[PDB]
Amino acid sequence: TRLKIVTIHQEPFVYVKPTLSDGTCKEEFTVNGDPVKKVICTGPRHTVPQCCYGFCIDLLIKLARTMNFTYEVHLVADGKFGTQERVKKEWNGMMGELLSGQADMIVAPLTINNERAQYIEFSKPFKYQGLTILVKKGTRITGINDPRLRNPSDKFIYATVKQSSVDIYFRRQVELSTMYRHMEKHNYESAAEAIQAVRDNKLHAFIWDSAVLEFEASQKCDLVTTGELFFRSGFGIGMRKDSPWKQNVSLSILKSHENGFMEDLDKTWVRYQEC
Amino acid sequence: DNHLSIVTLEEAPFVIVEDIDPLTETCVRNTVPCRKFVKINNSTNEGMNVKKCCKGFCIDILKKLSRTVKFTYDLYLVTNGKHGKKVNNVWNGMIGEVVYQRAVMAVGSLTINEERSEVVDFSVPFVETGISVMVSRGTQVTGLSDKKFQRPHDYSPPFRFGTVPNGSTERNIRNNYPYMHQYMTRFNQRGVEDALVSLKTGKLDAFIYDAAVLNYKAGRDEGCKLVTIIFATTGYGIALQKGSPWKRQIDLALLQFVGDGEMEELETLWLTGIC
Numbered sequence A: 001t002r003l004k005i006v007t008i009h010q011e012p013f014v015y016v017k018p019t020l021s022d023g024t025c026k027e028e029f030t031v032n033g034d035p036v037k038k039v040i041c042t043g044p045r046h047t048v049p050q051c052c053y054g055f056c057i058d059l060l061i062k063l064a065r066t067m068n069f070t071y072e073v074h075l076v077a078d079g080k081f082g083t084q085e086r087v088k089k090e091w092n093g094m095m096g097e098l099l100s101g102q103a104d105m106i107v108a109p110l111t112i113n114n115e116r117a118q119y120i121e122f123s124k125p126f127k128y129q130g131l132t133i134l135v136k137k138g139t140r141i142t143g144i145n146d147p148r149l150r151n152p153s154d155k156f157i158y159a160t161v162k163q164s165s166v167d168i169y170f171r172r173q174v175e176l177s178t179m180y181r182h183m184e185k186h187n188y189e190s191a192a193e194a195i196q197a198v199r200d201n202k203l204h205a206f207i208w209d210s211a212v213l214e215f216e217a218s219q220k221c222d223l224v225t226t227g228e229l230f231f232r233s234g235f236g237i238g239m240r241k242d243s244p245w246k247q248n249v250s251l252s253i254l255k256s257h258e259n260g261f262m263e264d265l266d267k268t269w270v271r272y273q274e275c
Numbered sequence B: 001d002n003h004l005s006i007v008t009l010e011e012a013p014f015v016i017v018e019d020i021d022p023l024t025e026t027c028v029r030n031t032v033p034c035r036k037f038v039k040i041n042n043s044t045n046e047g048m049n050v051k052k053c054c055k056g057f058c059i060d061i062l063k064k065l066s067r068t069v070k071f072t073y074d075l076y077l078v079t080n081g082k083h084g085k086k087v088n089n090v091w092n093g094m095i096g097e098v099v100y101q102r103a104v105m106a107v108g109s110l111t112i113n114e115e116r117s118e119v120v121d122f123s124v125p126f127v128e129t130g131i132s133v134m135v136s137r138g139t140q141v142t143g144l145s146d147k148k149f150q151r152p153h154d155y156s157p158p159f160r161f162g163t164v165p166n167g168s169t170e171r172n173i174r175n176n177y178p179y180m181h182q183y184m185t186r187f188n189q190r191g192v193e194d195a196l197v198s199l200k201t202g203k204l205d206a207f208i209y210d211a212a213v214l215n216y217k218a219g220r221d222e223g224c225k226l227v228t229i230i231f232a233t234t235g236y237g238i239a240l241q242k243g244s245p246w247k248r249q250i251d252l253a254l255l256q257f258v259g260d261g262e263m264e265e266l267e268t269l270w271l272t273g274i275c
């Protein structure tokens, strides 16, 4: 055993914080007096120890305790989810890390889709969500079909995160060729930068995972989401096709939905009442 | 071995069974042939296959899989139970048909849970579901987890609520809420139609059941009287025999349909509501 876990920064699934001066994590408590569990995670390729927690970290702990394994967590070196790019073709991001042997499992809000499943094994979904659009509170939009996205210009800017499944979908889809030409000039490196950019009117609309965006909107009152969910899909744990863990990882996730544990994680990390 | 025995079960709008044009014994276009074994009497194993015609959301999925993954099939309706229940350690229903190798796969409104995954392989989920509660509009309950369900006799009068036994909903309530389970058995309903009538006529206060079916029914409700207020999110999947060689391509095809828009078309075709 000793599984190498790759993950990525993405609140509220994985928070990433400095260790204190001794090498430990700040003792922290939920409302209710319950201890926030934290793990040491290495990340940037000059690596330093850091502190990780959130929904995905609690899931990993649950998984490690259930199936009886030990692990080391690192943040993905390039900061990316993973797409297959021309060099003849190669995966970057967490996908690349898993396929090369840098990681043995991806534990992250990693979307389950056809192209990734051709190369890796996904668990049953630990979370169900889709895509939506985050704007600054002033803005009224229909959604992904509103004219300001459909007929773009410099007078309303929209973007997604690079080396995401959403980015390379916009690149490959014929009817999206004009929206991509606009997004090409504005796409960001990380969801957090993009979210900040919207707060400051440097970005008018950010297309991203509803689980993340609705969370943002629940916490910050100067943000809102709009449109219906589209491309409803799941997040899954990622493993190589010959991982011997794949059956029991999937069984554990099913058990955790059925017994209330996942709803527990949602009450702790995802369902906030600041707005 | 391209010609597959496949079992299904009637449950609108996922699978709808109609009588065959009695002159022609030919299934009208848009429907596929399905057989049902019908006993001659109750004192005998003797019976005859009746030719019927099958359509619906799941049927359309089957037709798409058949073309993409390149198999032909002989579809039949399960007669030994319904979706699947373990009785004295023996599986009945569609799950049983797969476990004991009378079918290569099971297609329909078949919920993925842990105990069934122990004995069958499941595809990726292709319809999102779980456990919901249907009530007459105005009824105030927070969800499955409310104390009106968990401790019914704390209240005067006690809420009247029930499910259709022997499926995934009842299995889940049995494992998680023992007092709720035993109280509910008094109000259990033979099927969904019985349940909706009980609700509409004041004989039942709530009906707990599969979320996909309840949402559909709510959306088609005359007057929009019946509403739903999802616990244990999961989905419907194709069940296959453990270690099935068809699983790889079926999973890929299902994920392709999500990313192609073909799934969205089927949803509109079959599951749209007014309310």
Ligand SMILES: CCc1onc(C)c1-c1cc(F)cc(C(=O)NC[C@@H](N)C(=O)O)c1
Pocket: A081, A082, A109, A110, A111, A112, A113, A114, A129, A130, A131, A163, A164, A165, A166, A167, A169, A208, A209, A230, A231, A232, A233, B258, B259
């Ligand atoms: C069937 C899934 C699918 O197919 N085509 C597209 C586009 C999507 C899709 C849906 C979704 F809800 C989130 C993401 C995503 O890329 N999110 C970002 C990140 N979680 C990632 O995994 O890259 C991608």
Ligand SMILES: N[C@@H](CCC(=O)O)C(=O)O
Pocket: B083, B084, B109, B110, B111, B112, B164, B166, B167, B168, B169, B170, B209, B210
């Ligand atoms: N879809 C359920 C049946 C209905 C229910 O019990 O909610 C199953 O596959 O058992």
